[PDB]
From a paper:
The membrane domain of the mycobacterial ATP synthase is embedded in the IPM, with the catalytic F1-domain of the enzyme extending into the bacterial cytoplasm and attached to the membrane domain by a central stalk and a peripheral stalk (PS). As do other ATP synthases in eubacteria, chloroplasts, and mitochondria, the enzyme couples a proton-motive force (pmf) across the IPM generated by respiration to the synthesis in the F1-domain of the enzyme of ATP from adenosine diphosphate (ADP) and phosphate by a mechanical rotary mechanism. The mycobacterial rotor consists of a membrane-bound ring of nine c-subunits, attached to an elongated central stalk, made of single copies of the γ- and ε-subunits. The mycobacterial PS is made of two proteins, bδ and b′.
In the current study, the concentration of BD employed was almost an order of magnitude lower (25 μM instead of 200 μM), and this lower concentration proved to be suboptimal for the detection of the BD itself, as the drug was present in only a minority of particles. Therefore, in the various states and substates (see below) the density for BD is highly variable. However, in the current work, by combining the membrane domains of all of the particles, bound BD could be modeled in the same position as previously reported in close proximity to the N-terminal region of aH5 of the c-subunit in a position that would inhibit ATP synthesis. This position is the “lagging” site. In the mycobacterial enzyme, this inverted L-shaped half-channel is clearly present, but the water molecules that form the Grotthuss chain were not resolved. The mycobacterial inlet channel in the a-subunit contains the polar residues aHis12, aHis15, aHis16, aAsp30, aAsn104, aGln112, aAsp117, aGlu122, aLys125, aGln192, aLys219, aAsp222, and aGln229, which are probably involved in the coordination of the water molecules that form the Grotthuss chain. The proton inlet pathway then passes through a small aperture between α-helices aH5 and aH6 formed by residues aGly196 and aAsp222 into the interface between the a-subunit and the c-ring. A gap leading to this channel is plugged by residue Gln7 of the b-subunit and another, between aLeu111 and aTyr124, leads to the membrane and is presumably blocked by lipids. As in the bovine and other ATP synthases, the outlet channel is more open and funnel-shaped. Polar residues aHis146, aArg153, aLys161, aHis166, aAsn174, aGlu177, aGlu178, aLys181, aSer184, aTyr240, aGln243, and aGlu246 are found in this region.
Residue numbers in the entry:
A (entry chain a): 10 to 247
B (entry chain b): 23 to 84
C (entry chain d): 1 to 61
D (entry chain M), E (entry chain N), H (entry chain T), J (entry chain S), L (entry chain R): 2 to 86
F (entry chain L), G (entry chain O), I (entry chain P), K (entry chain Q): 3 to 86
The structure:
Amino acid sequence: AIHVGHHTLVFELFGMTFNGDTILATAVTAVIVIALAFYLRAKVTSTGVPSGVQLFWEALTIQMRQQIEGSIGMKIAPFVLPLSVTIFVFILISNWLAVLPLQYGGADGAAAELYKAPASDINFVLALALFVFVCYHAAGIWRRGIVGHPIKVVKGHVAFLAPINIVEELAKPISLALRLFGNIFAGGILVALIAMFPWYIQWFPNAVWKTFDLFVGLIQAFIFSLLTILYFSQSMEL
Amino acid sequence: NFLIPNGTFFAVLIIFLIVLGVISKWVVPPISKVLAEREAMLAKTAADNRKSAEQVAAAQAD
Amino acid sequence: MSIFIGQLIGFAVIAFIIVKWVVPPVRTLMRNQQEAVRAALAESAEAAKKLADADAMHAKA
Amino acid sequence: DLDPNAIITAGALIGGGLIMGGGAIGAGIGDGIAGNALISGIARQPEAQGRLFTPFFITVGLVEAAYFINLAFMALFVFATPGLQ
Amino acid sequence: DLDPNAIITAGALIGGGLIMGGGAIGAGIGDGIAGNALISGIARQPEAQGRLFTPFFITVGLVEAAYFINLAFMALFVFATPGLQ
Amino acid sequence: LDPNAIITAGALIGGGLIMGGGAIGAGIGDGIAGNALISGIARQPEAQGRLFTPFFITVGLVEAAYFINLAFMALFVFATPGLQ
Amino acid sequence: LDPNAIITAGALIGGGLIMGGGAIGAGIGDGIAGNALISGIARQPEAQGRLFTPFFITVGLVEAAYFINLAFMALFVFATPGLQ
Amino acid sequence: DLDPNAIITAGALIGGGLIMGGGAIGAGIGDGIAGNALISGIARQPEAQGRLFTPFFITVGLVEAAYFINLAFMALFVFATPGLQ
Amino acid sequence: LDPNAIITAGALIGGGLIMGGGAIGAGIGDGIAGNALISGIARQPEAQGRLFTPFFITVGLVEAAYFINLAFMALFVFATPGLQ
Amino acid sequence: DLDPNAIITAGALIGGGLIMGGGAIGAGIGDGIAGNALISGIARQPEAQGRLFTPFFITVGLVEAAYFINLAFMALFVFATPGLQ
Amino acid sequence: LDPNAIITAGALIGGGLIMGGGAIGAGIGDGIAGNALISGIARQPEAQGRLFTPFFITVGLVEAAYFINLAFMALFVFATPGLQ
Amino acid sequence: DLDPNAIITAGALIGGGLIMGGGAIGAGIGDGIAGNALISGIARQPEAQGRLFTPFFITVGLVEAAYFINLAFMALFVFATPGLQ
């Protein structure tokens, strides 16, 4: 027994089902991020030695601003910077909160996690990917009217490949979501699989996998942010 | 099944939005101001060094 | 329970690895950036004082 | 005896698996090759990066298309299985 | 004791899956290689885009012709299955 | 016999194909991208920093296929479509 | 079990294998030949004039191998040998 | 009268074999390519040896990892077979 | 059921495998050899005459394998060994 | 009226064959690529041989391992078959 | 049902797999070796003969594997081990 | 109503075919790549033919070791089938 899926704390509202566990995980990640943000806002010092939180936040901002300026000028697309930094920090915290020892035995021989990475739920990745999709398409609309944007995305860089371009435009959101999903989803299974070992043998593969999963989550957050920035740059040109 | 989207899609979105709002209003603007002020401070330090270098010579000349 | 104990031992191993071989370099990077900022502030202060002294000398001459 | 729909569904699952495996191989290797080109070009001409993305992603576009097209048809195999009774 | 159409449909689905897997592998890798050439060329000669996009698109046209011929034959296999009775 | 058994065998084989193809693509693409990265760094070591961004973009583009395949394999073997 | 059904399923699988292999070969060979052509034209533009000669030979040797498969695939599916 | 668990187990064994074959191909070829880059770099700039090991182990980290992931999903298939009756 | 049906289905699948592998090998080998030829003619325009002799050897060898497979495919399909 | 062990053993043999085929493909191609790098390095720098064997053995170590793991699991598939009864 | 039918179908599929692998390996390896030969002859015409000693060795290895497969394929399809 | 040994033998034959196909692919491609390196090295450096055979022989030995281990295990599969009663 591995119990793939099987969300807990599921409830109903307005004839719509909600996976309580993923909402709780997302809320915990948001609380952590907001606490970091407010700790920064109470410690920003332009005339002093920066604190660790300020160093981390400004490193993130510098990286995202450098990427934007490399792709599309900051003056052209200022909002992409907050969008990219928030996406990065959200995904990174969500993935790295899984390293904590919140896994236990469910009394049926199957492992159960008190905290499960929200990106292992299709709803989370779909929300992020579709928000980015709508955002950069709206940015392209603002750049080239209600009309030039669909025209230019359909024709793309080379017009006679219009069909492929359309597929490409549909592939951007899906690839953004599923990729992330898989990266986390697989991880959720691996630990569960490692839970089948006895403790005196479980400790080692679990340690190795979670140590690697730290880097996996970092890389996934970075890739999501970079691709969001670059899609924004593509949608806003000429 | 697990690949079928649910109502959670909205809930998560809402949370993300508020986080973005915070990051948009209390993280990125202050950080941009700090970075710009640091760069202006470095430029001002270089300019002050240059003015000192030219003035130490102008005073001797005059 | 058993899987919880095994996973906790694994997490202890992870934390040991992180503190032993990851915390030192990142802490050094943070210290380096902090010292760079502090040195930049010192450069600003000393350059302002140098400009003040040069202006005083020029006024004297 | 046996249910014809079961045989058709097993065949559809195997066919969709083949579709997605082939698409995966093609996409992964093609993207790796294009990224090798991009990484080399950047390593040799830093400032060229800005002008390298325009062709690079064009390539990737095509390389992605097939994959996702395959994915689309895989859905038709496992959710709208043609010939299923 | 089974409907022959079921066996034929399962075979047709598996064959179409093979066709599309092979087509996807070929398309992805060929496009990746041609795009690697294009990216490297534009890296060496930033002003060569005009001259390069012709051979690059000839190569892409050949590769996509193979891919879409495979796609058409998969459509034949799956929707109008030859030998279906 | 049980139709579900045949459908499950087909789903297992299909998921095996999906994951095998994904692993092949991921391994070879990652190897190629890492080869580009190592060659670039050996040629001019101080690009250690500027190369990582395009390298990780390539890694993301490569892993997209692999992990989309992993997701669809999980669908095949845990929520099998058309399972009677 | 009608013998023609088993034979037709086997023939369809075989034709699918034939076309998949042919497409893999054709796509990758065309990509490699086109890579050579694109690099050659990038190095020197006038060489284009001559480069299309060997290129068409290479593609000629590639596409041919593909098209033969096509024919045989047809033989497999439309006039199945040993159809019984 | 054939036991369905037998068919499910045979399918699981075939799927696990496919997973491990794909993982082995990917790991072997990716590690070989990364090692080719490493050997060429060390031949070119011996004193860069150490500074080359950083990207190398990253590539291996992203290659070998995938292989071992496949390994896990093989064990599942052949030790906790999904859908087993 | 009829043994002929099973044997013919197996023969068709085997012949499909033979031809698919032959097509993959021929296409990719011809592409690689033609890439070498195109690059050589690009770098040294006057070398076109000299490069055919190796190129026709390489291609020859490659084609050999393909056509040998083709022959065996026919033996599988039209003269199925073990048929009964 | 078929022995379940027969079906499971046939599946195990096919899976082990897939495992060994993938392992051999990966091992052969990876070793060939690493050796190509080694041969090129020794050709360009005849004296570099000494050092080049260090990274080479690493690459082979990362390749052959992937092979010899597959081997082990193949021995598991066809000698202690999971799910057998 | 005749067990020999099942064994013969399995033998035909196995022989098809063996020939597919042999053809792929032979074609691609010969293409790569010939690419090296053509590039070397383009670079060093004086070496045209000199390069044939290693080239043949390479081919001698590649083809050898191919032909070994061929032998075993015969053993699979003509004297099938396990008929009963 | 099939002999269990018949199904086992068919599975063993398919598995051995997979073993030999994978081994042949790996051996051919690895030997081709090693020979590519050898030929290029001899072309660039005329007198390196004598000293290049050592790394070339090492690479070919690894590749052929993989191939012949596969051959031995195919012989095991086909002539002494594990699990065959």
